[PDB]
Amino acid sequence: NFDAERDALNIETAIKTKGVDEVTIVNILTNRSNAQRQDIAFAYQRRTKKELASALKSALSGHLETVILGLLKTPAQYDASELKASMKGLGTDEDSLIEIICSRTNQELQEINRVYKEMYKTDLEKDIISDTSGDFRKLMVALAKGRRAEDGSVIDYELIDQDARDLYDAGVKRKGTDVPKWISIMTERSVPHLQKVFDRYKSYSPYDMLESIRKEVKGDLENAFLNLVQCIQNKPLYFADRLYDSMKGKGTRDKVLIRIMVSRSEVDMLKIRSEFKRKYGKSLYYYIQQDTKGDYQKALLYLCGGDD
Ligand SMILES: [Ca+2]
Ligand SMILES: [Ca+2]
Ligand SMILES: [Ca+2]
Ligand SMILES: [Ca+2]
Ligand SMILES: [Ca+2]
């Protein structure tokens, strides 16, 4: 059914329509997979000899432009560009750097590292170093390598118990904190293993892993650990909470809302929606509908994939 040549022609017609037909552009692009959007971009240049991204940047504006241009990038290109943006200047937007590095898998990070180097002619690790310091830097650099252990064929209960005790003895039990121990265990063990470790951890500490972090460390280091533990425990819930935070109260933190809707639309949006509804009462669709307007709202609601 999909025909990149047909979609490209219709988009060209919309772009050249007096006043620009943003609706048609949104109706098409937010209802095509990332791979299909790539096919559409190639078809567009094949037909017009002009680049689709450039054409749309000129035709669109505001938040809608941000969403559409984001959707046109491959997943790795989008993440790489978002990382670059987070470290721009003094890299004050540590929250975004943390969101991406803490939530991406080994496979995703491998491609991100490759693409980042191709796009910016520099190692992602080097820019991360420039935008981080102390143990926060050590944690972020370790995570960005995307070398977390593979899932084992058999559950290692003795190791699970061992890691749980080490996490306790390294933090809540002693004065100060053995941060390197925390970094090693939380970056090197597989996610399923760590989920069990954090559960077993409750047998040694009166505070769960998250509260232990709030009591042991502070600043960006603390936020990085909190974000990482949430992604390990329940990634869809992690994104649901970030989405809620991006819309709660006056205004909207579009940078976060847009990035999550674009980057997770084809990954785990159904689960994100389920967790969102379960925790906040209203559907993600409802929150988006209430926090945004026009074609921008339309685009985000299509990426949401439906109401709950
Ligand atoms: Ca228009
Ligand atoms: Ca523009
Ligand atoms: Ca301590
Ligand atoms: Ca709001
Ligand atoms: Ca808004």
UniProtKB/Swiss-Prot annotation:
Keywords: Acetylation, Annexin, Basement membrane, Calcium, Calcium/phospholipid-binding, Extracellular matrix, Host-virus interaction, Isopeptide bond, Phosphoprotein, Repeat, RNA-binding, Secreted, Ubl conjugation. The modification N6-acetyllysine is found at K18, K121, K196. SMART domains: ANX (SM00335). There is a cross-link at K18 (Glycyl lysine isopeptide (Lys-Gly) (interchain with G-Cter in SUMO1)). Its main location: secreted. GO terms for cellular component: adherens junction; AnxA2-p11 complex; azurophil granule lumen; basement membrane; basolateral plasma membrane; cell surface; collagen-containing extracellular matrix; cornified envelope. ISGylated. Annexin repeats lie at residues 2-73, 74-145, 158-230, 234-305. The modification Phosphoserine is found at S153. There is a cross-link at K18 (Glycyl lysine isopeptide (Lys-Gly) (interchain with G-Cter in SUMO2)). One of its GO terms (biological process) is positive regulation of receptor-mediated endocytosis involved in cholesterol transport. Calcium-regulated membrane-binding protein whose affinity for calcium is greatly enhanced by anionic phospholipids. It binds two calcium ions with high affinity. May be involved in heat-stress response. Inhibits PCSK9-enhanced LDLR degradation, probably reduces PCSK9 protein levels via a translational mechanism but also competes with LDLR for binding with PCSK9. Binds to endosomes damaged by phagocytosis of particulate wear debris and participates in endosomal membrane stabilization, thereby limiting NLRP3 inflammasome activation. (Microbial infection) Binds M.pneumoniae CARDS toxin, probably serves as one receptor for this pathogen. When ANXA2 is down-regulated by siRNA, less toxin binds to human cells and less vacuolization (a symptom of M.pneumoniae infection) is seen. Heterotetramer containing 2 light chains of S100A10/p11 and 2 heavy chains of ANXA2/p36. Interacts with ATP1B1. Interacts with DYSF. Interacts with COCH. Interacts (via repeat Annexin 1) with PCSK9 (via the C-terminal domain); the interaction inhibits the degradation of LDLR. Interacts with CEACAM1 (via the cytoplasmic domain); this interaction is regulated by phosphorylation of CEACAM1. Interacts with APPL2 and APPL1; targets APPL2 to endosomes and acting in parallel to RAB5A. Interacts with S100A4. May interact with UBAP2. It may cross-link plasma membrane phospholipids with actin and the cytoskeleton and be involved with exocytosis. This is Annexin A2. It comes from Homo sapiens (Human).
